[PDB]
């Protein structure tokens, strides 16, 4: 179990770590979060009590270094930093735990939720989408635009998701216009999976990461990307059976975790109705269709 220690909590803020959120009060005894499960990426995110504008946060993996949080009163935010002095870090964390100055990551032992949301997400791939190679962790916030969004404005602060565009020369073979527009299997299997992602695990990892940035930060371009990657699969007549089964599980846990009160802004009615009821894969997503119909029947 690993630890994200704070230097202190000077401004009132809602802190989240993966699917958990808690409030920390204006000058309250707080030195961080302990008992963080090793083996998964994690995200620690912030929403200031006084300006809920800009949710922001950090993706990190404790196996890649010792990370802490320290408020910066000049830039006005909680910043993640790496401690290179390993002995110093352990001493600090120890000292902190002794004084019970930390909240406990409360992992129900029955609960596989976070694994199921992050199964294919890798820090190395996050760092290629979020370009800031001097840090081992990645900053994301509510307002960062995607490369594709910037095509339709600071390149260094963008989310470099794989561009998907169904009316593009990449998507459409000369001479197979109707075939390739109505059945996206060429774009999915040859262009994206064989060509770009190399395998379905990398494709699913980007899909999961896009969903999590949409949900945790309200990042609109991430929501677009999540839906585009779903639609590309469901709109392909030829998809490896193992990918369809895994997609159903992925989407199931994403819909299960989505806050009910956010469904209005995080779910695209057209994409979901097409995917579940009109697409080539309309009958391949049994678990996802069941939770959608029982939890969000209004959208449909």
């Amino acid at each position: 179990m690993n630890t994200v220690p704070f230097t202190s909590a000077p401004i009132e803020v809602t802190i989240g770590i993966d699917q958990y959120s808690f409030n920390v009060k204006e000058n309250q005894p707080f030195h961080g979060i302990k008992d963080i499960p090793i083996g998964h990426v994690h995200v620690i995110h912030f929403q200031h009590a006084d300006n809920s504008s800009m949710r922001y946060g950090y993706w990190f993996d404790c196996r890649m270094g010792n990370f802490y949080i320290q408020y910066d009163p000049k830039d006005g935010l909680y910043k993640m930093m790496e401690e290179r002095d390993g002995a110093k870090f352990e001493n600090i964390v120890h000292n902190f735990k002794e004084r019970q100055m930390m909240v406990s990551y409360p992992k129900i032992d029955e609960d596989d939720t976070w694994y199921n949301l992050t199964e294919f997400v890798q820090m190395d791939k996050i760092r290629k989408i979020v370009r800031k190679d001097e840090n081992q962790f990645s900053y994301v916030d509510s307002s960062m635009t995607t490369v594709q969004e910037n095509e339709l404005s600071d390149p260094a602060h963008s989310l470099n998701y794989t561009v998907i565009n169904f009316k593009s020369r990449e998507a459409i073979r000369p001479g197979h216009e109707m075939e390739d527009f109505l059945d996206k299997s060429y774009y999915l299997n040859t262009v994206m999976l064989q060509g770009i992602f190399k395998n379905s695990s990398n494709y699913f990892g980007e899909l999961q990461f896009a969903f999590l940035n949409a949900m945790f930060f309200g990042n609109y371009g991430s929501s677009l990307q999540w839906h585009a990657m779903i639609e590309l699969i469901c709109s392909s007549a030829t998809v490896p059976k193992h990918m369809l089964d895994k997609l159903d599980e992925i989407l199931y846990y994403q819909i299960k975790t989505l806050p009910e009160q956010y469904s209005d802004i995080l779910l695209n009615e057209r994409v979901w109705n097409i995917c579940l009821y009109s697409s080539f894969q309309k009958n391949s997503l049994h678990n996802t269709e069941k939770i959608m119909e029982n939890k969000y029947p209004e959208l449909l």
């Binding site: 009316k167 020369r169 459409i172 000369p174 216009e177 109707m178 527009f181």
Partner: protein
Amino acid sequence: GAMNSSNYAELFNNDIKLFVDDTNVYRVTVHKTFEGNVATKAINGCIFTLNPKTGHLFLKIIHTSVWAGQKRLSQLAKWKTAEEVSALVRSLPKEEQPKQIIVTRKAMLDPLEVHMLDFPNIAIRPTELRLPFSAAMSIDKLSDVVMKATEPQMVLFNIYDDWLDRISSYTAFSRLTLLLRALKTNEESAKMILLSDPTITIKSYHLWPSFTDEQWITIESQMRDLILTEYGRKYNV
């Protein structure tokens, strides 16, 4: 974006543009089978591609053989249309290629956009005008070349005959659309109007009769009356 009554004079400016109408591409007769089921039989069709400024009509004849062994023919027809429009554009010298292509039905937008990805600078637009180009097959010389075709074929016409010698494109287009609207609403009455007077003939190299300016005004008025009549007979006014 879309083309409507607000931006109607744009049709007659000096940016090359084409209308594409696909309503006569896939044409069938529905009939009973010996077993009392219903079946379709296709007949030849055409793509109606028109430059509204010049009157040039690129009539691509769609021979029934193109449907042989194919499924979902009404959807294929839109993609075949887009393929042929794209082939026409590629065949034209760069200085003759259109800057915009306006489709008369919104279901043609995605097929044409996909076929034309190589031409990112050509705008593909819908229109809110309900244009009567479906009635092109009520022009006897166009219907005749379509039905006699034994293979795919493109035929070029000027749908304005020699009118531009005497009137503007705007007026020529208004005349054309009035004639086609009438032919669409009551073909027999429209044709009677057009051919009643045996002293006014259709030149071998024309589509419409050789009316004087005065006679065209008479004709145009009679075509309005007809459209008003049928609107009366239809709605009981």
